[PDB]
Amino acid sequence: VGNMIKPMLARGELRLVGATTLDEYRKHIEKDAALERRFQQVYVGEPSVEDTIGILRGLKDRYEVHHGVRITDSALVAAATL
Amino acid sequence: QALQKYSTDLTARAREGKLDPVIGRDNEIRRVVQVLSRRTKNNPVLIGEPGVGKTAIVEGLAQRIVAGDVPESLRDKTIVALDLGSMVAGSKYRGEFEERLKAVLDDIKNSAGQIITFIDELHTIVGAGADAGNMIKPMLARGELRLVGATTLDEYRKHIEKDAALERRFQQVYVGEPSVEDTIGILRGLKDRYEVHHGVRITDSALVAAATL
Amino acid sequence: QALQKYSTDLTARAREGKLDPVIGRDNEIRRVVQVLSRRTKNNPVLIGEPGVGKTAIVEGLAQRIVAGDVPESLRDKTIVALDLGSMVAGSKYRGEFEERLKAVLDDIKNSAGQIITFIDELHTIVGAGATAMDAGNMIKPMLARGELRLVGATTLDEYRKHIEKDAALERRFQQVYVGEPSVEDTIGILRGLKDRYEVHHGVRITDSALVAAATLSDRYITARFLPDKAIDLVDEAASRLRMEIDSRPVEIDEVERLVRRLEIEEMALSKEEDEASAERLAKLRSELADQKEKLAELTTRWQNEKNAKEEVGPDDIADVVSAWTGIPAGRLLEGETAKLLRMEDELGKRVIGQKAAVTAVSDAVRRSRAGVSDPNRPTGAFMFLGPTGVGKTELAKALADFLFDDERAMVRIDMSEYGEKHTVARLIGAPPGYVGYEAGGQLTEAVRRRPYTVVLFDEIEKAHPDVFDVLLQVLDEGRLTDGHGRTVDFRNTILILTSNLGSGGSAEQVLAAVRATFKPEFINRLDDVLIFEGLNPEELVRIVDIQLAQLGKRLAQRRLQLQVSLPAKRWLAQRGFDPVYGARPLRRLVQQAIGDQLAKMLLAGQVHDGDTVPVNVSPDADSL
Amino acid sequence: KEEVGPDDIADVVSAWTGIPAGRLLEGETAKLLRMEDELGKRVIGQKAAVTAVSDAVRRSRAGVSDPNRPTGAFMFLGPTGVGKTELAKALADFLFDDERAMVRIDMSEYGEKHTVARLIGAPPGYVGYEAGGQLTEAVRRRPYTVVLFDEIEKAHPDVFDVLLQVLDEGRLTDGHGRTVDFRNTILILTSNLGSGGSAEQVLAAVRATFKPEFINRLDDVLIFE
């Protein structure tokens, strides 16, 4: 999105959870939609350096068995900042 | 078996109690009835800025029919929720949407004049062409189907008024937005549905403050 | 036999008499006949605006064939109506459409000139079956030799959108322009048609209704054409009347529904374990009782009239034209004539003084309901001017309030922004082929909907002296034309042009400044150029009363109210000084002297919701 | 204490649109009472003005103010370098804690007639039409800002005929024909009339420069010491 899911949706039997980008959503769901009255926006901008560092250090063991070499917090933070 | 896979039954839906209890707006229901009960060219079209309840009037008419509060020549008519999103959708050939549209029209006009029809957002009626949404006029301007509609001001002006010879077959019912007092009335009417859905309670002062803010 | 499978019949329907009778239109049918009976290229195509009758002519021709009033060479021809829809039902294969078309064509040809085909809306014949043009012109050879006759009727703004583009085919068609009839002929059409409706609905119809409908449908509904927008009014009136011979008439069913609503509401609002419901329920009881009284009174009057309304009259038409295109055009049914005779002292509640202007506005509104006004000219075009803070904008808003009950239902344009000439396109739309064109005009597409609103022109003298020239037609008659060329109607909207010319010179110097800031032919359009006058210290006391009423009504949201003593009430007006700034200083004084202290107390405790506070004067200020 | 209340709705309608509409929940009242002094830490001097703006905010949020008119239309003027723009910025920093969340426009640029189109837009059929107007776009969202008019003495007396109805109604109409509401903003417009003269030599400059229809619109004309 077209006109084939709105008669299904304004009845209360299905629940769709979608996803897209900001400007794209502003394109296909604003001009030709007339449906935006039944869609609720949720914003997820971007994590920060400190947050993606936690993400990395959470997701480290999986690769330490995939390849398996060694990991250093210095390497993680360097990757993040660089 | 023609209008069985391209339509539902809004009347039977209201009989199953799964509709919302419209409150007020008796002027517009009476206007819609005294238009839908005409002799020729009986097709009302609910017009008004978006959000003010242009479908709620049609559900109200359905509930009133089910309850039996309508004039003599309006009982047991079983208004039908037609749809075109599922007729023009799967068709990749020459002249295939036409067979479906003609089957629907034929099934309507075989039965007596008791299949009052309802297309919502009928600004999706001028397309389907490529000579579509245009073979319907000979049955429109003769009182064969009733075709209760609902469209926004903008879409109406942009999509229909460019096709004047079709706009003639319609009647406008300007559904203006309600005032604060009528809004409080409607809110107080609907309170119980949400009070049941969410296991909480809602105060009348809260309703008034909502309708005022 | 393929005909009997891909087409209906018309002469049969005529013989069994299912076609509405046809009246008038003699020259058109004669021309159609003499074209339909020529040697080569005998194809009439009825053209003209939508609604004026382009199929009724063909059905009249069918009736005339059944009767026998046609010339010799048109005897017993059995007109047939094709159907290009059911000819393309299933043709997903390659030739399943050309086969059917050839079948129908050779079947027409094997009939020795008997059949006279009739394709309704023949502008759909162009793209019969495509993929590169192959179909829809298979009848182009047979047309020329006059094998088939092919009478058809299509609208006027599509004959140059689809067919005229293909002038190889259009050449084989003769056009029969069909103009719209006048009121004198519409009256006859109705007088002849005034049986089918009178029968379908079990009612009777009076000729006064026919005449009044044929007049109002031309005066007011300026969007459709005459033979149809007139019949619609009669039909809806009869439908409503039949719906009233049902159990109960209107104006009582609505009141009983409203009473039941207020009952079901007061019943469920009573069990409120709350305090904010005390003063909200005390009025609902009053309203329920005072509507049930009217219910009982209407009931008793109906029983009287029933113990001591069977056909439509020339006023139910007015009620329909009022319910649709909400212009009110009834006959002043005694429910509001008191209101109209009271209009002066009813507007005096929001404006104090300026009885001269209130009288002019009241007269121009009154003498239009009684049908004495100029039928093609706006309902009045006033420009009232004077010093500032006097009440001109307030009077305009008060008039819109009294008329509509909703101040937010008038059209207000600030002519202080139109300082540049080119900004006039903001209210007239941009020509075709430019940026903003699909949205049309703004003032125009505001008036075209609900053409009963009030129009208002703030600060007319600030605009460039070329915006003034767009309003000449608007004031002379009710016509303005946006980009799309269409024309809106201003015949029944009350124009108002506020201003500030000649601040305080004299009651005559300003009548020499206006004539120097305008043109000689612009002043000539307006009605009386009302001149406001400043305020007197005796007149500001009532203004103080009004401001205090406003402040109390706004405070009643926190269930407070005040008790003002006459010392302070006259002190405030005694501080309505400097007869140069009108009456706004009084508003700023009320603020500065009451609101600040009231808020200071209110948000510092000690003034908890409920209890009223009395204001009492002091030597210089006033304390609470 | 397991049911919705008539202030949770205000909580929602303030949780979006930014408007602080409510019934003076706790802490907020302490801040409002503690305003004249809390604003003094950034604006030393000018005792007369801070009280006026503070009373305006107090009235507007306490529940006694005309719902259809701006929340104040002050124009304060005085000698050079006294703290006018700085008072405005300190206010905006007080009730937002974001110095860059107000909409200031420099009236020093609009010495030309036609440059007004930046805060209105262009009529239908001209170059910049679908973009809108700068001021109108900035105010249609964030309907709680603090509009400012830096040194409104330069723009020759035609821009005074848009504020003439921005004030007293909070109305403005951009190119597309829309309408915006200024009903809950605080318009503030400085100046430099006077320049040394007494209060009765600058109150003549105001009269001889502007019009009665204008001076009558805006609120108290604060003079700075």
Ligand SMILES: Nc1ncnc2c1ncn2[C@@H]1O[C@H](COP(=O)(O)OP(=O)(O)OP(O)(O)=S)[C@@H](O)[C@H]1O
């Ligand atoms: N008179 C009424 N009685 C009861 N519920 C109403 C009434 N008017 C409006 N509503 C409710 O308000 C909402 C309006 O939704 P709809 O009327 O279905 O939307 P709509 O009027 O079709 O506008 P669009 O064009 O579809 S976005 C629904 O939740 C209705 O239940």
Ligand SMILES: Nc1ncnc2c1ncn2[C@@H]1O[C@H](COP(=O)(O)OP(=O)(O)OP(O)(O)=S)[C@@H](O)[C@H]1O
């Ligand atoms: N001369 C006439 N005598 C009687 N009734 C007429 C006459 N002219 C028009 N009418 C009626 O006025 C209405 C006009 O209907 P039509 O002529 O069928 O519409 P139309 O002219 O075909 O316009 P379109 O574009 O096809 S919708 C019908 O109710 C006709 O019965």
Ligand SMILES: Nc1ncnc2c1ncn2[C@@H]1O[C@H](COP(=O)(O)OP(=O)(O)OP(O)(O)=S)[C@@H](O)[C@H]1O
């Ligand atoms: N006769 C009056 N009756 C009641 N209130 C009045 C009257 N005259 C003035 N007022 C008050 O003064 C306010 C300002 O008057 P307005 O008419 O709005 O100003 P104006 O007449 O438009 O003058 P200009 O030229 O536009 S500044 C009104 O909103 C009222 O509150």
Ligand SMILES: Nc1ncnc2c1ncn2[C@@H]1O[C@H](COP(=O)(O)OP(=O)(O)OP(O)(O)=S)[C@@H](O)[C@H]1O
């Ligand atoms: N009472 C005061 N409190 C705090 N800073 C002040 C005060 N008076 C002056 N200042 C400082 O004076 C400087 C100039 O203040 P501004 O308000 O920016 O100048 P201005 O008032 O705009 O004068 P013009 O006419 O625009 S040049 C800033 O650095 C302020 O911090």
